[PDB]
Write a protein that binds this ligand. Sequence first.
Ligand SMILES: OC[C@H]1O[C@H](O[C@H]2[C@H](O)[C@@H](O)[C@@H](O[C@H]3[C@H](O)[C@@H](O)[C@@H](O)O[C@@H]3CO)O[C@@H]2CO)[C@H](O)[C@@H](O)[C@@H]1O
Ligand SMILES: [Ca+2]
Ligand SMILES: [Ca+2]
Length: 683
Amino acid sequence: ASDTAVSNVVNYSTDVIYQIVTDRFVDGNTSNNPTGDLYDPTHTSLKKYFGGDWQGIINKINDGYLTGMGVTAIWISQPVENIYAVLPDSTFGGSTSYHGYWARDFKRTNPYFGSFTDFQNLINTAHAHNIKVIIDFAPNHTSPASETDPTYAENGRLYDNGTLLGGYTNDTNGYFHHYGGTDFSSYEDGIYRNLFDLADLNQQNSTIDSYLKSAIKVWLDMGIDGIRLDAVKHMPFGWQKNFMDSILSYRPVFTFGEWFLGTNEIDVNNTYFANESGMSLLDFRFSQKVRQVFRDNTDTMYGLDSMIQSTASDYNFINDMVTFIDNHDMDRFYNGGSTRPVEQALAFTLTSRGVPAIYYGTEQYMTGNGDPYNRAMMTSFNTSTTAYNVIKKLAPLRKSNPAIAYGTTQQRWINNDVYIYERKFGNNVALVAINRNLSTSYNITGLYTALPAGTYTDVLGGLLNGNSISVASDGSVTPFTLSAGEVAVWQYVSSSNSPLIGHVGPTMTKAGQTITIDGRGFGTTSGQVLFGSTAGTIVSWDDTEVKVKVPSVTPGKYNISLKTSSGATSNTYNNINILTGNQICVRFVVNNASTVYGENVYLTGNVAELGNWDTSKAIGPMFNQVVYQYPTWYYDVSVPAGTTIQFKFIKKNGNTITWEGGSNHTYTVPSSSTGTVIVNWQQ
Ligand SMILES: OC[C@H]1O[C@H](O[C@H]2[C@H](O)[C@@H](O)[C@@H](O[C@H]3[C@H](O)[C@@H](O)[C@@H](O)O[C@@H]3CO)O[C@@H]2CO)[C@H](O)[C@@H](O)[C@@H]1O
Ligand SMILES: [Ca+2]
Ligand SMILES: [Ca+2]
């Protein structure tokens, strides 16, 4: 099998995701439509059900709309059962669960979308057409509730395959967080507090932890090829890391979370998450910058490049970052005026690092500022749009040009309006020229490239006013004019490659598991995969793909390297996280840990999951507000189940490290349910 295989659910670098808002796409079956207040046949009441269903998607697949576009994957709304109540709205006079973000039963389907049967047809049909199916998943909450008024909505009631677990009011079981609502003041504030009025789930609760894990297996069993975790910014890192392990242990599938970042916003917690959570993230830094440059004009091409560079240093796995120019939460990219800007944003995105995602209707020039104006019904299905063709032409490149899929990014020419970058993966190359100026042409001189000597034509076929170029023996390019709004794409696909690792998934494993190595020039005869210096067991060997079983090495981060049967050594793919064992979520609590100003408390310990006594990699700074109040600190950490750990807390400020006194604390991590440890600061 090849990395481009639809069966390659662990890699998305060569794919193109098409984000669909189920209800607003296509009503393939009217018989399943809602009745009364819920439904709106007219499609004018933006907060009501329109009738979009899985059958409608199936139709768009079978009819060639999506396929003809070059889309290799689809990301649909949460398939789980939603509340049935019609919330009050002043503007739209009615607010429903049309979006599927108000869960009611994570073990059942949304009757309006279809049945498990209709879901299967979707999965199957999609697969038969070589399209991967991604689903939205929001384990952070249920629905909008009011502790005071159990008469509001459905009180955020949670069901387990029909049987009620509990509501928001009278939550004797402690399934929810009754800490009020978040104001985004702090990281901890937005975790243990309500996201708006949504009933916050207490994943620390054994029942909830188990429920959520089993709930996901239901869908994994349905044949899904990916998951989009909702509000990963509103749940504890520890629990999420532990949740990921359960998924990857059951059946690995590409997973990416939603960590909202504003304009010019950079969050260290966000970076750490993407680097340790065991899941990928939506590239908000990318998305927000692209809009600044191509849409709102609040930054230059210089800002775009710096984003490309800073991004590449922060993220350990940039090839996994899910890019995009807009979404159901943002104002539609197209905001009137010229359509050139969108196309340039699409082309840039399609040829840039990571995994591109396209919001439904982008190719239709759909407009709409703010929710729910940005969630209008599918306008038209015209395949003539310049935007529709852009995707059609560029999408496939991700499969044909490994440089576009896993290659690096390097600037070759840049001014305030012009950006000429180059994607390189060995000998394979891709050169893209963009001129944001819709009225100014530029004379390009002094340009150099890795493109072999010769004459290159535009892959876009002049679609965006692009043309051909000539590269000299010294990689120099003949001076040319970059007309206004021009977009050109030149490439060179090598005929022969050396061992080159482009991708590795998953990035979070355990000894005995199987990882998939994607790249080029591995050979047809089995070679050797090494986790540092320790060789693994080959499960399958191909020129572009290698499946290997993780060796029983010391749990920790490892660097992957390949070795063809001919002795040729590949490049290394670093920071593969090898855990100690099955993860479990344990809450650490330490009392009487008073500190000075600017001093925080951290957790260090016996295992890799605990940093292995490395104070620089200590867990924290620990929390001290919501659940527990200072001087008592706490934190949700993922640890190896059934393991006896030795730990100790420390205080860190910036230039000082105060360890806890006495002997190390000892604890045996549970095997099933979640756990909690409470200790007192040793002097
Ligand atoms: O040869 C010395 C010089 O070479 C390298 O410079 C290259 C730039 O890195 C590259 O950006 C490009 O420069 C263009 C600028 O992007 C643009 O602002 C405008 O000024 O046109 C320039 C083209 O001349 O090309 C040059 C090479 O031609 C290298 O990076 C430098 O450190 C070094 O000084
Ligand atoms: Ca319908
Ligand atoms: Ca939460």
